[PDB]
From a paper:
[name] encodes three distinct [name] hemolysin coregulated protein (Hcp) secretion islands (named H1-to H3-[name]) that act against both prokaryotic and eukaryotic cells. TplE is an antibacterial lipolytic toxin and [name] interacts with TplE to provide protection from TplE. TplE, a new [name] trans-kingdom toxin, targets the conserved and essential cell membranes of rival bacteria to cause bacteriolysis, while [name] functions as a cognate immunity protein to prevent self-intoxication.
Next, we also obtained crystals of [name] alone and determined the structure at 3.06 Å resolution using SAD. The similarity between the free and peptide-bound forms suggests that the [name] structure is highly compact and rigid, and the “L” peptide binds via a structurally stable pocket on [name]. [name] is assembled into a highly rigid structure, not only in the apo but also in the peptide-bound structure.
Residue numbers in the entry: 32 to 298, 305 to 333
The structure:
Amino acid sequence: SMDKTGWITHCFGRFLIDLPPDAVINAGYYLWGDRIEYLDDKPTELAARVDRLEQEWRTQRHKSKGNMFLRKIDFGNESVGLLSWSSEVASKTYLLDTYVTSKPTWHVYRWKGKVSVDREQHAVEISRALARNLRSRAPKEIPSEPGFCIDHAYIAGDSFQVERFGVGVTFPEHPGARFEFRSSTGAELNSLLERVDGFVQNMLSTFAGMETLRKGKHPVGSLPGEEYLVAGSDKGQRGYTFMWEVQGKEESLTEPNLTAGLAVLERPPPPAFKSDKEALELWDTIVDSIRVRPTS
């Protein structure tokens, strides 16, 4: 824990975070509500996918006597899009399946979502730009440029954009334990304590076998993070439920809603930790490493 030797600093969206080298990491990234998704397709494979999927939309009935395919849009920068009706019933909505590529190193990402007839051109203009802003980042590179980092790449820019990610992390040394780190634009209406506190006291006072290890402020650098940590024993198993949270500012990339959490279930398998001490060391070491990525 406190001995951050061999620990690896990672990139997720606008932020950085240190983690032990043993950690098993799995991340999800979302843009304008819709998931941006990495594909391990070499250029020929993607061409096959798009061709295969285009013909599928054509051999699929829309309403009575028309197919579901509409357009194959070219966003340039080696990227493409497929416009289709939102479903078998027209409504007034499409499905814009975007396939953006990274530069200079080749990767392709699928970014798909529904859009109305009256906003299709706008959505295209977004994909048009996402295509020329999506740049690749080297395996261990920590980009100095402004941008939202994703899998094997980042979306360059400091212009506002709703963005969100969620990283699930497990540790082999500490089995049963699960850490999660999430970011999301938009501000929550209450702080952590203002929201959850009342109910936690009503559960702790009601049910036995638990104690509030910590509570209150836990600022990390310029980030105003409150925290709540609960622990308890049952089944001869020691359970944990931690959380840290910056409630974030509206229309802000650098101070969005930002949450770190760690939990260990009960219900004897091997201990996730030796004691409460070891658990809070890991928790504090990781949370204190949270920070906005320095950007020129």
